[PDB]
Design goal:
It comes from Homo sapiens. The chain is α+β, with helices and mostly antiparallel strands. It is built from 14 helices and 15 strands. The protein has four domains: 171 residues, Alpha-Beta Plaits; 70 residues, MutS, DNA mismatch repair protein, domain I, CATH 3.40.1170; 58 residues, 5' to 3' exonuclease, C-terminal subdomain (DNA polymerase, domain 1); 119 residues, Dna Ligase, domain 1 (2-Layer Sandwich). Strand 10, helix 8 and strand 11 form a beta-alpha-beta unit. The chain binds the ligand Nc1ncnc2c1ncn2[C@H]1C[C@H](O)[C@@H](COP(=O)(O)NP(=O)(O)OP(=O)(O)O)O1 and magnesium ion (2 copies). The ligand Nc1ncnc2c1ncn2[C@H]1C[C@H](O)[C@@H](COP(=O)(O)NP(=O)(O)OP(=O)(O)O)O1 binds next to strand 1, helix 1 and strand 3. It binds a DNA duplex through strand 3, strand 7, strand 12 and strand 14.
Length: 418
DNA sequence: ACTTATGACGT
DNA sequence: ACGTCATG
């Protein structure tokens, strides 16, 4: 019934903003965004504080536009090195967080600001230690129970406590429900440890799988955690849009909506697994049939380290690189940042990348990557990497350079122990 | 002219 | 191996 494991998803609240606000006290408790490349339209927003969201400011907005919605908006710029954005500060901030999470349980780095946790084992330990002890409300100061309260509240904290009381009073409530509660107690502790040790606040979702735990985390932001039990799923999914569920945000979800003629996740229950398979594939049908019943089996991978390391730049419109000299210069600029990142990787993580991937895009092409080619990554030399990368894409030139290049991408892959 | 990184799947 | 999809 997918009530076998306890899985959590922890996600930092407006991460890049918190990172800047910690370092610059002035930006704290104020409408705040983080931008990059100020020259064109004040730059592009990649992170918005909650105060700034009250005014309607969103990521992928122009800073000049954001200022129109929010006159008093404070802006922080991404560091620029070698003529491109540099995310080093946010990656180091990430490492602090990932390290604190590691002490509690085994984690899967899902993004720079979020990881999954498997609390299944930890829950078992706590119960033996905690055996015969009731769970106090004090143990869950920031926990929301989805679907509660019900029955017999005007303030949001009042609703939270009321729901928490009903759930705790029942714990009536099964063995898998008790495990989620202990799972959540542990998440309270882990979240408190993050803020105390780094100054960063965050939200969390606690459930039986990664899809639900991720959905749960969203429900109460920021600085709150949410438990989505097995029993809540039917009511929660019933009015829940398909696009909301992870991996249904793009084309597949659209085709499910278009083919099946439904709009909510719950509506999938009526169809047989075979029906779903025939429409959307064997792998997807099977996945859909279980997910709408709240059952998901993807494992929490024990991976704290990124599989791959890469850098890229985009040369939109006029700025597009139409000469051999420019292509050579930016590969070198990219290869140089890559070398710094790669060297650090070896010292911290005892591993080396064996392959190098070059991806490029050209004018008139929609696709993120027009093409990609690879070659051997034998040495961490920016000049060699840049020179080799030129060699594997040099043919690409139809011609000077034609067509001019929209983007350059260099990626390191295939790391091995050492 | 929403950029810059990531991971997984299909074939 | 190379393209594509999905996500942050
Ligand atoms: N499309 C994008 N392009 C570039 N950088 C991005 C990005 N999306 C996110 N980032 C960077 C900047 C972001 O701060 C960060 C975290 O990812 P989120 O969790 O998706 N968003 P946040 O933590 O800001 O807040 P909250 O979760 O509470 O809504 O990654
Ligand atoms: Mg976040
Ligand atoms: Mg996130």
């Amino acid at each position: 019934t997918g009530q076998d494991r306890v899985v959590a998803l922890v996600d930092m609240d407006c991460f890049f903003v918190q990172v800047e606000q910690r370092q610059n006290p002035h930006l704290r408790n104020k409408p705040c965004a983080v931008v990059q490349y100020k020259s064109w339209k004040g730059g592009g927003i990649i992170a918005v504080s909650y105060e700034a969201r009250a005014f309607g400011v969103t990521r992928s907005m122009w800073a000049d536009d954001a200022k129109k919605l929010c006159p008093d908006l404070l802006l922080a710029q991404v560091r620029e090195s070698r003529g491109k954005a540099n995310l080093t500060k946010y990656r180091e901030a990430s490492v602090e967080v990932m390290e604190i999470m590691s002490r509690f349980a085994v984690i899967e780095r899902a993004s720079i600001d979020e990881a999954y946790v498997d609390l299944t084992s930890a829950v078992q330990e706590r119960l033996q230690k905690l055996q015969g002890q009731p769970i106090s409300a004090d143990l869950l100061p920031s926990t929301y129970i989805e679907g509660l309260p019900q029955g017999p509240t005007v303030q949001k904290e009042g609703m939270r406590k009321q729901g928490l009381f009903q759930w705790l009073d029942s714990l009536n409530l099964t063995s898998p429900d008790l495990q989620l509660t202990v799972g959540a107690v542990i998440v309270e502790e882990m979240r408190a440890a993050i803020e105390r040790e780094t100054g960063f606040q965050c939200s969390a979702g606690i459930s039986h799988n990664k899809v639900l735990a991720k959905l749960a985390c969203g429900l109460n932001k920021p600085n709150r955690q949410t438990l989505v039990s097995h029993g809540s799923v039917p009511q929660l999914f019933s009015q829940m849009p398909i696009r909301k569920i992870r991996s249904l945000g793009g084309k597949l979800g659209a085709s499910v909506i278009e083919i099946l003629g439904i709009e909510y996740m719950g509506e999938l229950t009526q169809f047989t697994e075979s029906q779903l398979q025939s429409h959307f594939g064997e792998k997807n049908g099977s996945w859909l049939y279980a997910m709408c019943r709240g059952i998901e089996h993807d494992p929490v991978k024990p991976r704290q380290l990124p599989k791959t390391i890469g850098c890229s730049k985009n040369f939109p419109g006029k700025t597009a690189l139409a000469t051999r000299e420019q292509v050579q210069w930016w590969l070198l600029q990219l290869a140089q940042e890559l070398e710094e990142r790669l060297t650090k990787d070896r010292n911290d993580n005892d591993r080396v990348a064996t392959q190098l991937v070059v991806s490029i895009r050209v004018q008139g092409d929609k696709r993120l990557s027009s093409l990609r080619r690879c070659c051997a990554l034998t040495r961490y030399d920016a000049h060699k990497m840049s020179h080799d990368a030129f060699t594997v894409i040099k043919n690409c030139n139809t011609s000077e350079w034609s067509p001019p290049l929209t983007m350059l991408f260099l990626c390191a892959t295939k790391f091995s122990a050492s």
